[PDB]
């Protein structure tokens, strides 16, 4: 019995008990090493204690790891005698079955061993077992003292031959993903052998400064049009700050102090709400339909957060409907007092660029309509989205439109799920119009388009979205960026929504299945590779 | 102007209870202050990411030390794993009092803090240290908590291959916290390094790794060792030592053995390609298993010229040695290497880590040096000499120069008065007699203008037992007597375990017991008030390795020299019920070549426990809030707050 490490196992302890070991039959200093883990106290290991085991007369062999059938073997076993007085002893090896023994048989060997010293037996046994042999030898002593010692370790012979190892290189993509492994063919294949296959695959997998955006950040004040001046950005801040996580690096509690700014603005602008909710400029002047699209898609997108009440804007949204002509158009009742929170919107045409606008703000107000209820409000209201793309897409086939209204046509159809052949020509429209990270200090109406356009390609990111976004940011980058209103809540959606394009991360899983029809039956195998390499 | 404090590690950990610390200062002490403090992320619309708890403390009892949990379920409710750029959390603390009184713009203040899924201590553990191919392989695990405990949590297995590759995995849920598993090794695996890790299911990045490397061996009968006459060779130019080394050959039981040592030499570079020298080949007989041999400085120096390399050119060359012993009349041999041996120009090492940066001025600035021969014990009695030189700005450099004999563990401390309105601070430590080695660092003074600084000394200066008193004396410095009372804080393993109030007299002394707790260091962080401008000063304090808690006591019955064949009874003693995991494991798997990687001790279990520590450096800063980043705190008084930690480690 010559182990290695014996002494593998776990008991519970009383401050006391004695557990007696019998000591393995070998010639080392064990040392014993161990762990106490404890409920109270805890972990402690002990110090290392040295067993000495040791025999004053031995003898020591060292088969050697492999031993190849048929070839001649040499066998030392050599005799160790620390005591006093010179031994006469005798070695012979005992006579197994599988080997030949030099000898022959159970031939006995005499050498004298003086104190002190070391005297080795040659031995010359060529091995002809199939896979192993035992192998014991007996060094017999004389009548002076009677001592002796016997050592027996297993005596392994490996197979016939050389070992061969193949390599198989291959790549994988998800054309070409059935190919065939032939099988093994070489002629130098043993009959008789071990055939040990193994699968080895690798996985070889490959902004703005939210400082500036900050001081966006404004509380409400004004009457009802120097209002939306001061939500708008607001929300567009709050809106990027949250969605492009840069809350941590601003002070911990601006957060709170733009939820609170956001609950006063809501509180405030819903107090100027007339029977029909279209939040005029003033309860006495008339409503604006423009107005009350910004007003339906900025409270829908904060109605997220604010507890609001979604019927009080479904109504909203059934009187915006009213104010739809057959084609499908929309014309304001009454102008803005002031033109310069329009910014892209005067220019050659309006009709087209108002109804674009429009069929963004109903897009955003489907989500806050609720699942149950209001089903004839859902089917109207999709009816009239339909009706709209019907008309923004004839009048961009007309085309000779503006580089604005082509891109926020472009981006109406295309979040409003237009059919394929529209949103195709006015692709290909707003492609024709792509200037060239040059792309389109500049004014308002050019970061409108950019940021209509990449909007829209994002709907529709290919080695595009990212080189004008370059040019985006670097122009918002500029100090006081985003002179007028609607710019920067559009700028500020779509850095936010290219950021989210950019940055995200997938399964990466390569799953493969390994099947073949042997003669033993038919094997499968898979392998997940979501996240390393496995064999 | 009161104001209200926020306290808690820079990072977070899930799973386990959060320290957090809230403070009130400049009270009119007739006002009762309530509210809670809890975990949100900004991202998701400010959802309780954690549950909710309340300090509701007063003036005279103007400390509170609150205990946080963190539940992972409220976690992976909260979105945290569904971030895009870092794990950065928000930590705030909600009270209405601070809106109405105070008139800020908000009811509530808070901090930014970065969260990390690692958790606990997890300890894996081998068979064997050496393996060779077509054996079978045991293993076993300990999970453990950030306290020390037993742990039941459920972990992953997983078996690394030699070329990064995974082989098995397996699932587990210990519910006595200790597991064990078998494992075959392929037979055709090529020798090279293998590991093992593991990690809680519920975890990530708690993973923990162990190396067993796998060989084609087959055990030796005794090993042999070369153990140089001094470590080092001096090479510095017109002296040369004399180098001599000796060969001990034992059997793995003790006994002497006999036979002949062969020995070739050679060179080693920054590399390691290799080489030899041609006619400076020893071939000796062993006597008694000891063998001595050296050679000249005449034929080292023949063999230079022959080689051409150039005494000069011995700056960081390692001389190599190699030992080809047989022993007679087996036969069998084995090999011996002596890579660690350099060519140094100095006997002694310097090191300057724990002597702190950014001197204060107006207290007696504190040197602190290691002194240690190279690759060796630390060492004594050897006297060290500086020549400290005050930059200041007003007049001309002065050059104050003072000495001092090594303490007996290689520590030295020698306190040195700094004047005010200084530039900078230049010295050189020089320890050595003769052949010093030259250590130079500067320091630059804070910058002027601010309010009074804090000074720490520590008398004793020496790291204290576990169980001691250490002392602490606290003096302010400038016209700031404006406070009343010093506030003061320990650190340990990134949490806030103590916290107290001292009051101002003309002699501060701040007594602080170290338990097991504060191992194996723990910071001291202390602050007053000028005004309004915080100001505090830092000290990290190391603690001795000690002992057990547990009480582990593992003997044998003496040396009798046991038999083969034989009994012996084990004794062993626990301090409380516990269990132990015996290993029994052969020397000569040491004696194969390796590169005899150390078994598992106190040492690594101490490591793996401070592996835990935020804060970097000495410590010590210019201002407040640099100080108290360093140190591993995140601070926030609602006019200075803490940045966010660049990454996890520092
Ligand atoms: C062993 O042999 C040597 C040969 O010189 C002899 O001197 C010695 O006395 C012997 N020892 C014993 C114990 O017989
Ligand atoms: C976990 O494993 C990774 C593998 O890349 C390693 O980098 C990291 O250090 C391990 N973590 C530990 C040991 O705490």
């Given at each position: 019995f010559?182990?290695?490490?014996?002494?593998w196992?776990?008991?519970?302890?009383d401050?006391?008990?004695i557990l007696?070991?019998?000591?393995?039959?070998?010639?080392?200093?064990?040392?014993?090493?161990?762990?106490?883990?404890?409920?109270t106290?805890?972990?402690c290991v002990a110090?290392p204690?040295?067993?000495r085991?040791?025999?004053?007369?031995?003898?020591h062999?060292?088969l050697?790891?492999s031993?190849?059938?048929?070839?001649?073997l040499?066998?030392?076993?050599?005799?160790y005698n620390?005591?006093?007085?010179?031994?006469?002893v005798?070695?012979?090896?005992?006579?197994v079955?599988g080997?030949?023994?030099?000898?022959?048989?159970g031939?006995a060997?005499?050498?004298?061993?003086?104190?002190?010293?070391?005297?080795?037996?040659?031995?010359?046994?060529?091995?002809?077992?199939?896979?192993?042999?035992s192998?014991k030898?007996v060094?017999?002593?004389?009548?002076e003292?009677p001592?002796?010692?016997?050592?027996?370790?297993?005596?392994?012979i490996?197979?016939?031959?050389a070992?061969?190892?193949?390599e198989?290189?291959?790549?994988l993509?998800?054309?070409?993903?059935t190919?065939?492994?032939?099988?093994?063919?070489?002629?130098?294949?043993?009959?008789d052998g071990?055939?040990?296959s193994?699968?080895?695959?690798?996985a070889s997998?490959p902004?703005?400064?939210?400082?500036?955006?900050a001081?966006l950040?404004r509380?409400?004040?004004?009457?009802?049009?120097?209002?939306?001046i001061?939500?708008?950005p607001?929300?567009?801040?709050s809106?990027?700050?949250?969605?492009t996580?840069?809350?941590?690096?601003?002070?911990?509690?601006?957060?709170?102090?733009?939820?609170?700014?956001?609950?006063?603005?809501?509180?405030?602008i819903?107090?100027?709400?007339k029977?029909?909710?279209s939040?005029?400029?003033?309860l006495?002047?008339?409503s604006?339909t423009?107005?009350?699209?910004?007003?339906?898609?900025?409270?829908?997108?904060?109605?997220?957060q604010?507890?609001?009440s979604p019927?009080?804007?479904?109504?909203?949204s059934?009187?915006?409907?009213?104010?739809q002509?057959?084609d499908?158009?929309?014309q304001?009742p009454?102008?803005v007092?002031?033109?310069?929170?329009?910014?892209?919107?005067?220019?050659?045409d309006?009709?087209?660029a108002?109804?674009a606008?429009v069929?963004?703000?109903?897009?955003?107000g489907?989500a806050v309509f609720?699942d149950?209820?209001?089903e004839?409000?859902?089917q109207?209201?999709?009816?009239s989205?339909?009706?709209?793309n019907?008309?923004?897409?004839?009048?961009?086939?007309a085309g000779?439109?503006?580089?604005?209204?082509?891109?926020?046509?472009?981006?109406?159809?295309?979040?409003?799920?237009?059919?394929?052949?529209?949103?195709?020509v006015a692709?290909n429209?707003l492609?024709?119009?792509?200037?060239e990270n040059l792309?389109?200090?500049?004014?308002?109406?050019?970061?409108?388009?950019?940021?209509?356009?990449?909007?829209?390609?994002?709907?529709?990111?290919?080695?595009?979205?990212?080189?004008?976004?370059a040019?985006?940011?670097?122009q918002?980058?500029?100090?006081?960026?985003?002179?007028?209103?609607?710019?920067?809540?559009?700028?500020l959606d779509?850095?936010?929504?290219?950021?989210?394009?950019?940055?995200?991360?997938e399964?990466?899983?390569?799953?493969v299945?390994?099947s073949?029809?042997?003669?033993?039956g038919?094997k499968?195998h898979?392998?997940?590779?979501?996240n390393?390499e496995?064999? | 102007?009161?104001?209200?404090?926020?306290?808690?590690?820079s990072?977070?950990?899930?799973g386990?209870?959060?320290?957090?610390?809230?403070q009130?200062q400049?009270?009119?002490?007739?006002?009762?202050?309530?509210?809670?403090?809890?975990?949100?992320n900004?991202?998701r619309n400010?959802?309780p990411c954690?549950?909710?708890?309340?300090?509701?403390?007063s003036?005279?009892?103007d400390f509170?030390?609150?205990?946080?949990?963190?539940p992972?379920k409220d976690?992976?409710?909260?979105?945290?794993?569904?971030?895009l750029?870092g794990?950065?959390?928000?930590?705030?603390?909600?009270?209405?009092?601070?809106?109405?009184?105070?008139?800020?713009?908000?009811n509530?203040?808070?901090i930014?803090?970065?969260?990390?899924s690692?958790?606990?201590?997890?300890?894996?553990?081998?068979?064997?240290?050496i393996?060779?191919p077509?054996?079978?392989?045991?293993?076993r695990?300990?999970?453990?908590?950030?306290?020390?405990?037993?742990?039941?949590?459920?972990?992953?297995?997983?078996?690394?291959?030699?070329?990064?590759?995974?082989?098995?995995?397996?699932?587990?849920?210990?519910?006595?916290?200790?597991?064990?598993?078998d494992?075959?090794?392929?037979?055709?695996?090529?020798?090279?390094?293998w590991?093992?890790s593991?990690?809680?299911?519920?975890?990530?990045?708690?993973?923990?790794?162990?190396?067993?490397?796998?060989?084609k061996?087959?055990?030796?009968?005794?090993?042999?060792?070369?153990?140089?006459?001094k470590p080092?060779?001096?090479?510095?130019?017109?002296?040369?030592d004399?180098?001599?080394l000796d060969?001990?050959?034992?059997?793995?039981?003790?006994?002497?053995?006999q036979?002949?040592?062969?020995?070739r030499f050679?060179?080693?570079?920054?590399?390691?390609?290799?080489?030899?020298?041609?006619?400076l080949?020893?071939?000796?007989?062993l006597?008694?298993?000891?063998?001595?041999?050296?050679?000249?400085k005449?034929?080292?120096?023949?063999?230079?010229?022959?080689?051409?390399?150039?005494?000069?050119?011995?700056?960081?060359?390692?001389?190599?040695v190699?030992?080809?012993?047989?022993?007679?009349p087996?036969?069998?041999?084995?090999?011996?290497?002596?890579?660690?041996?350099?060519?140094?120009?100095?006997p002694?090492?310097?090191?300057?880590?724990?002597?702190?940066?950014?001197?204060?001025?107006?207290?007696?600035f504190?040197?602190?040096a290691?002194?240690?021969?190279?690759?060796?014990?630390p060492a004594?009695?050897?006297?060290?000499?500086?020549?400290?030189?005050?930059?200041?700005?007003?007049?001309?450099?002065?050059?104050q120069d003072?000495?001092?004999?090594?303490?007996?563990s290689?520590?030295?401390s020698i306190?040195?008065?700094?004047?005010?309105?200084?530039?900078?601070?230049q010295?050189?430590?020089?320890?050595?007699?003769?052949?010093?080695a030259?250590?130079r660092?500067?320091?630059?003074?804070?910058?002027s203008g601010?309010p009074?600084?804090?000074?720490i000394?520590?008398?004793?200066?020496?790291?204290?037992?576990?169980?001691?008193?250490?002392?602490?004396?606290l003096?302010?410095?400038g016209?700031?007597a404006?406070?009343?009372?010093?506030?003061?804080?320990?650190?340990?393993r990134?949490?806030?375990?103590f916290?107290?109030?001292?009051?101002?007299?003309?002699?501060?002394?701040?007594?602080?017991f170290?338990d097991?707790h504060?191992?194996?260091?723990?910071?001291?962080?202390?602050?007053?008030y000028?005004g309004?401008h915080?100001?505090?000063?830092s000290?990290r304090?190391?603690?001795?390795?000690?002992?057990?808690?547990?009480?582990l006591?593992?003997?044998?019955?003496?040396?009798?020299?046991?038999?083969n064949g034989?009994?012996?009874?084990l004794?062993?003693?626990?301090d409380?019920?516990?269990?132990?995991a015996?290993?029994?494991?052969?020397?000569?798997?040491?004696?194969?070549?390796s590169?005899s990687?150390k078994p598992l001790?106190?040492?690594?279990?101490f490591?793996?426990?401070?592996?835990?520590?935020?804060?970097?450096?000495?410590?010590?800063?210019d201002?407040?809030?640099q100080?108290?980043?360093?140190?591993?705190?995140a601070?926030?008084?609602?006019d200075?707050?803490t940045?966010?930690?660049?990454?996890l480690?520092?």
């Amino acid at each position: 019995f010559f182990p290695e490490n014996w002494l593998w196992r776990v008991e519970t302890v009383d401050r006391f008990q004695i557990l007696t070991l019998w000591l393995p039959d070998s010639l080392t200093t064990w040392e014993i090493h161990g762990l106490s883990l404890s409920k109270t106290k805890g972990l402690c290991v002990a110090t290392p204690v040295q067993l000495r085991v040791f025999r004053e007369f031995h003898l020591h062999l060292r088969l050697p790891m492999s031993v190849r059938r048929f070839e001649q073997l040499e066998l030392r076993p050599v005799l160790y005698n620390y005591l006093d007085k010179n031994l006469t002893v005798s070695v012979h090896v005992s006579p197994v079955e599988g080997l030949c023994l030099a000898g022959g048989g159970g031939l006995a060997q005499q050498v004298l061993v003086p104190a002190g010293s070391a005297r080795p037996v040659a031995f010359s046994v060529v091995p002809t077992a199939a896979a192993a042999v035992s192998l014991k030898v007996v060094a017999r002593g004389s009548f002076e003292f009677p001592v002796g010692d016997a050592v027996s370790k297993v005596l392994q012979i490996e197979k016939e031959g050389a070992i061969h190892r193949e390599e198989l290189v291959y790549e994988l993509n998800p054309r070409g993903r059935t190919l065939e492994i032939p099988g093994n063919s070489d002629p130098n294949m043993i009959p008789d052998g071990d055939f040990n296959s193994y699968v080895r695959v690798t996985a070889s997998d490959p902004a703005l400064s939210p400082g500036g955006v900050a001081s966006l950040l404004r509380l409400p004040r004004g009457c009802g049009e120097q209002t939306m001046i001061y939500l708008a950005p607001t929300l567009a801040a709050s809106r990027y700050l949250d969605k492009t996580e840069q809350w941590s690096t601003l002070p911990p509690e601006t957060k709170d102090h733009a939820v609170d700014l956001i609950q006063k603005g809501y509180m405030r602008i819903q107090q100027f709400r007339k029977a029909d909710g279209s939040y005029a400029a003033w309860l006495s002047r008339d409503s604006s339909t423009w107005l009350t699209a910004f007003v339906l898609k900025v409270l829908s997108l904060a109605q997220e957060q604010v507890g609001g009440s979604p019927e009080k804007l479904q109504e909203t949204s059934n009187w915006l409907l009213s104010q739809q002509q057959a084609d499908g158009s929309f014309q304001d009742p009454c102008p803005v007092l002031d033109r310069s929170m329009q910014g892209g919107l005067v220019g050659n045409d309006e009709t087209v660029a108002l109804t674009a606008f429009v069929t963004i703000a109903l897009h955003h107000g489907l989500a806050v309509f609720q699942d149950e209820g209001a089903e004839p409000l859902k089917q109207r209201v999709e009816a009239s989205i339909s009706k709209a793309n019907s008309f923004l897409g004839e009048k961009a086939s007309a085309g000779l439109l503006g580089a604005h209204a082509a891109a926020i046509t472009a981006y109406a159809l295309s979040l409003t799920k237009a059919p394929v052949d529209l949103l195709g020509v006015a692709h290909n429209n707003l492609m024709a119009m792509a200037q060239e990270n040059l792309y389109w200090q500049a004014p308002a109406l050019w970061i409108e388009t950019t940021a209509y356009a990449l909007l829209h390609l994002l709907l529709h990111k290919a080695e595009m979205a990212d080189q004008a976004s370059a040019w985006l940011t670097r122009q918002g980058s500029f100090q006081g960026g985003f002179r007028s209103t609607q710019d920067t809540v559009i700028a500020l959606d779509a850095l936010s929504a290219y950021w989210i394009a950019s940055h995200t991360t997938e399964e990466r899983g390569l799953n493969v299945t390994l099947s073949s029809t042997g003669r033993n039956g038919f094997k499968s195998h898979a392998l997940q590779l979501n996240n390393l390499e496995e064999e | 102007k009161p104001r209200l404090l926020l306290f808690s590690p820079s990072v977070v950990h899930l799973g386990v209870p959060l320290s957090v610390g809230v403070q009130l200062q400049d009270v009119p002490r007739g006002q009762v202050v309530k509210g809670s403090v809890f975990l949100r992320n900004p991202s998701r619309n400010n959802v309780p990411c954690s549950p909710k708890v309340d300090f509701t403390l007063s003036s005279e009892r103007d400390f509170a030390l609150l205990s946080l949990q963190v539940p992972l379920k409220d976690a992976k409710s909260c979105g945290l794993h569904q971030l895009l750029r870092g794990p950065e959390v928000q930590l705030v603390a909600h009270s209405p009092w601070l809106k109405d009184s105070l008139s800020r713009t908000t009811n509530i203040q808070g901090i930014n803090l970065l969260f990390s899924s690692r958790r606990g201590h997890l300890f894996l553990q081998t068979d064997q240290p050496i393996y060779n191919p077509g054996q079978r392989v045991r293993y076993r695990v300990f999970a453990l908590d950030q306290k020390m405990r037993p742990s039941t949590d459920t972990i992953t297995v997983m078996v690394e291959n030699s070329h990064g590759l995974r082989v098995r995995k397996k699932e587990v849920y210990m519910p006595s916290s200790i597991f064990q598993d078998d494992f075959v090794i392929p037979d055709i695996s090529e020798p090279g390094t293998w590991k093992i890790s593991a990690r809680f299911s519920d975890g990530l990045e708690s993973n923990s790794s162990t190396q067993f490397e796998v060989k084609k061996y087959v055990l030796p009968n005794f090993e042999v060792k070369i153990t140089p006459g001094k470590p080092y060779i001096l090479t510095v130019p017109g002296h040369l030592d004399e180098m001599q080394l000796d060969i001990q050959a034992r059997y793995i039981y003790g006994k002497p053995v006999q036979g002949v040592a062969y020995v070739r030499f050679g060179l080693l570079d920054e590399d390691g390609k290799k080489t030899f020298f041609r006619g400076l080949e020893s071939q000796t007989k062993l006597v008694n298993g000891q063998s001595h041999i050296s050679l000249s400085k005449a034929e080292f120096q023949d063999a230079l010229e022959k080689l051409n390399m150039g005494i000069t050119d011995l700056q960081g060359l390692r001389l190599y040695v190699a030992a080809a012993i047989i022993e007679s009349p087996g036969g069998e041999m084995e090999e011996a290497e002596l890579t660690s041996w350099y060519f140094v120009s100095s006997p002694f090492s310097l090191d300057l880590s724990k002597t702190k940066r950014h001197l204060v001025p107006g207290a007696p600035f504190l040197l602190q040096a290691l002194v240690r021969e190279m690759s060796g014990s630390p060492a004594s009695g050897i006297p060290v000499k500086v020549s400290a030189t005050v930059s200041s700005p007003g007049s001309v450099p002065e050059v104050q120069d003072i000495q001092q004999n090594t303490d007996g563990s290689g520590q030295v401390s020698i306190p040195i008065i700094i004047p005010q309105t200084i530039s900078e601070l230049q010295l050189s430590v020089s320890a050595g007699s003769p052949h010093p080695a030259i250590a130079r660092l500067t320091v630059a003074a804070p910058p002027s203008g601010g309010p009074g600084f804090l000074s720490i000394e520590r008398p004793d200066s020496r790291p204290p037992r576990v169980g001691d008193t250490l002392n602490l004396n606290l003096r302010a410095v400038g016209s700031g007597a404006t406070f009343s009372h010093y506030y003061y804080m320990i650190l340990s393993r990134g949490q806030i375990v103590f916290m107290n109030r001292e009051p101002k007299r003309t002699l501060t002394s701040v007594s602080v017991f170290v338990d097991h707790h504060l191992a194996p260091s723990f910071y001291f962080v202390a602050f007053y008030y000028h005004g309004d401008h915080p100001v505090a000063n830092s000290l990290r304090v190391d603690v001795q390795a000690g002992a057990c808690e547990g009480k582990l006591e593992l003997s044998v019955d003496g040396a009798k020299q046991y038999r083969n064949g034989e009994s012996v009874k084990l004794h062993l003693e626990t301090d409380s019920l516990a269990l132990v995991a015996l290993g029994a494991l052969d020397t000569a798997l040491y004696a194969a070549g390796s590169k005899s990687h150390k078994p598992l001790n106190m040492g690594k279990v101490f490591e793996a426990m401070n592996s835990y520590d935020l804060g970097c450096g000495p410590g010590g800063g210019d201002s407040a809030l640099q100080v108290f980043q360093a140190a591993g705190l995140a601070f926030s008084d609602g006019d200075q707050w803490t940045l966010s930690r660049k990454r996890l480690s520092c």
